[PDB]
Amino acid sequence: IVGGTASVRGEWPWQVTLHTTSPTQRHLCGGSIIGNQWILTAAHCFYGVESPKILRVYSGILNQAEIAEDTSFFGVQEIIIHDQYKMAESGYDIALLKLETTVNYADSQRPISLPSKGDRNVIYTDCWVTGWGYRKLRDKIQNTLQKAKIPLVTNEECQKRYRGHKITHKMICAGYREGGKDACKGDSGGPLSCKHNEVWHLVGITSWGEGCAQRERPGVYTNVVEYVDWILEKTQ
Ligand SMILES: NC(N)=NCCCCNC(=O)[C@H](Cc1ccccc1)NC(=O)c1ccc2[nH]c(=O)cc(O)c2c1
Numbered sequence: 468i469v470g471g472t473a474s475v476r477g478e479w480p481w482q483v484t485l486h487t488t489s490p491t492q493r494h495l496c497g498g499s500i501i502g503n504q505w506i507l508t509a510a511h512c513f514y515g516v517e518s519p520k521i522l523r524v525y526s527g528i529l530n531q532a533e534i535a536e537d538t539s540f541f542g543v544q545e546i547i548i549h550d551q552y553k554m555a556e557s558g559y560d561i562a563l564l565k566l567e568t569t570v571n572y573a574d575s576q577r578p579i580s581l582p583s584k585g586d587r588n589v590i591y592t593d594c595w596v597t598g599w600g601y602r603k604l605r606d607k608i609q610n611t612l613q614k615a616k617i618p619l620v621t622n623e624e625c626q627k628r629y630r631g632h633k634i635t636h637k638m639i640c641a642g643y644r645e646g647g648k649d650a651c652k653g654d655s656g657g658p659l660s661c662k663h664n665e666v667w668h669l670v671g672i673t674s675w676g677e678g679c680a681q682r683e684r685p686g687v688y689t690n691v692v693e694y695v696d697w698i699l700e701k702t703q
Contacts, residue, residue, distance in 0.1 A: 469602050469680035470648035471615035476529045479597050481579035481669070482612065482657060484531065485512065485564070486523040486540075494531060494608050497598045497657020498524070498564065499669055500578045505702055506564040508656035509672050509689065510552040513562060519543040524566060527575035530610050531599060542567035547701050549694075555655075555675040558637050560689050562656075563701055579660060579669045582692040591661035591670060594619055594641060596686070600653030604679050608653045615648040617641040617659075619670075620685050628683050637693040639671050642685030649686050651679035659688045 481500045485508065486492055498508035506524055516522070523540040525533075547563040554560075570576055597614045601607065618641060625640035626633075634640065641659060642649060650657070650673045659671030671688025678684065
């Protein structure tokens with residue numbers, strides 16, 4: 468996260484850190500708890516991942532330093548990538564991780580609500596992006612989970628900023644005209660969480676953008692409300 472601040476322990480209890488153990492263990496991507504056995508994340512995170520056996524999901528983490536060889540984790544039974552996914556920039560950048568065991572919910576770890584199809588008309592004014600990613604384009608994975616408040620921008624406005632791309636209705640954009648706050652490398656797969664009527668909703672999945680936090684280059688996120696039928700279908 469560029470231009471953010473450290474999170475409070477437990478304030479984003481749906482946020483997980485997905486690790487790979489190959490060749491040695493490291494953070495791979497963010498993700499969100501959406502059900503007892505289910506993490507929602509980005510499809511592009513699994514480039515070159517041949518097997519779910521190299522994955523570990525850690526929940527209830529603030530600092531990466533909490534994760535040691537003796538720290539408990541959730542195994543991944545199945546990676547489910549959207550069948551129309553080809554690459555992040557062309558959309559469908561969405562994946563489900565079916566966990567080997569179920570998450571026991573607590574103040575440190577609990578699911579985020581998916582948006583309702585009836586909330587497409589809602590104007591979210593309280594949206595946050597979170598993760599352990601770089602704080603500049605050229606950086607490293609951070610110890611402490613970072614957060615940044617970022618305004619949504621219209622698809623028409625976003626499309627103006629990405630003339631070489633097609634910004635579809637299955638994408639959603641967020642950023643400041645002047646830049647300065649954005650997701651960056653290592654934040655992908657994590658949530659864009661918007662608070663509305665005292666309830667947090669998983670509005671976006673961190674997907675792509677041109678560099679990080681640049682002027683007139685909003686972040687692009689998977690528009691989660693467009694995938695609620697897919698999620699239901701795949702989680703049955
Ligand atoms: N809003 C904007 N401006 N962009 C959207 C966010 C940036 C997207 N890229 C990303 O977030 C990559 C995508 C990716 C995922 C998995 C594997 C490889 C690449 N992430 C990374 O490049 C990435 C992921 C995990 C990492 N772990 C480490 O220990 C060291 C790293 O340098 C590292 C880098």
